Curated annotation (Swiss-Prot):
<feature type="modified residue" description="Phosphotyrosine">
    <location>
        <position position="14"/>
    </location>
</feature>
<feature type="modified residue" description="Phosphotyrosine">
    <location>
        <position position="32"/>
    </location>
</feature>
<comment type="subunit">
    <text>Homodimer; disulfide-linked. Interacts with DUSP14. Binds to CD80/B7-1 and CD86/B7-2/B70. Interacts with GRB2. Interacts with PIK3R1. Interacts with PRKCQ.</text>
</comment>
<protein>
    <recommendedName>
        <fullName>T-cell-specific surface glycoprotein CD28</fullName>
    </recommendedName>
</protein>
<comment type="function">
    <text>Receptor that plays a role in T-cell activation, proliferation, survival and the maintenance of immune homeostasis. Functions not only as an amplifier of TCR signals but delivers unique signals that control intracellular biochemical events that alter the gene expression program of T-cells. Stimulation upon engagement of its cognate ligands CD80 or CD86 increases proliferation and expression of various cytokines in particular IL2 production in both CD4(+) and CD8(+) T-cell subsets.</text>
</comment>
<feature type="modified residue" description="Phosphoserine">
    <location>
        <position position="12"/>
    </location>
</feature>
<feature type="topological domain" description="Cytoplasmic">
    <location>
        <begin position="3"/>
        <end position="43"/>
    </location>
</feature>
Amino acid sequence: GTNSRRNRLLQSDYMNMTPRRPGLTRKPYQPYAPARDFAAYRP
């Protein structure tokens, strides 16, 4: 028991529940979705 946690865990907090979402993304997802219907089947 006893308080005074001290030396939590050198780097990387115990972030109860779960560690902050890991980025690991970088660069845009560039969805790129060429749609262009047909402008109302244009007469």
